[PDB]
């Protein structure tokens, strides 16, 4: 879930 409010979780930023 949203277990870390500091993390960007947009998949475009990690796998694009």
């Amino acid at each position, epitope marked *: 879930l949203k277990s870390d409010k500091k*993390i*960007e979780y*947009n998949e475009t930023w990690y796998s694009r």
Partner: antibody
Amino acid sequence: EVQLVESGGGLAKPGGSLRLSCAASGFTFSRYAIHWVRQAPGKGLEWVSVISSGGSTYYADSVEGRFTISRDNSKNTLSLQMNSLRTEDTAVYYCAKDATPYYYSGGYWYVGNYSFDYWGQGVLVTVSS
Amino acid sequence: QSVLTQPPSASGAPGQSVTISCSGSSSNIGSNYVYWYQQLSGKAPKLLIYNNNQRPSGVPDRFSGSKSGTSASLAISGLQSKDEADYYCSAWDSSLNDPLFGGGTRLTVLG
């Protein structure tokens, strides 16, 4: 000059809805997460919500599920939709720019450091029967 | 691991110093950056100190920040009547996964 000009707010009934908006200028909008922080009359500050540059959204426990934050990077605008309003939601609401631009570290992208260097003028939200 | 504990009020003499404390735990103050905000009457808060002891641009050096264990402190020297405001500490809590504010400290300048 950095400006965060808020609009919206006002009065609602318990269970009703209100929309807040924040217009940002004077800085690179897409480099910073933007938060909402509220303050009940004569009370202290409480972090409400955050939206990151990439659209990641986080909320305080008391408003999760009832509040929806969103942003438009092409319009340099931000909005907070507030549904299922409760009496304890009565407060002045500020939009607040994160003081730290998003950054990459240790394999993860970080939206900001949850400190606020610029604040909007504040908009009053009252929830009452 | 709690809500940051600040004394409701603090006072100091003009031209003298005052120290506002902020007590937390190991998961917030003890392991994370502390920030301090000043809020004048009827105005929005203003970032006063960041990263435990750093001063933003335009903050005079008579405002100082420090940290020790699970506590943090904001020191104000050369007290002026304009310094009367509410002062808030703030820190991340990794146990709660939440940003925390202190309850605020209302500063009175005597005289």
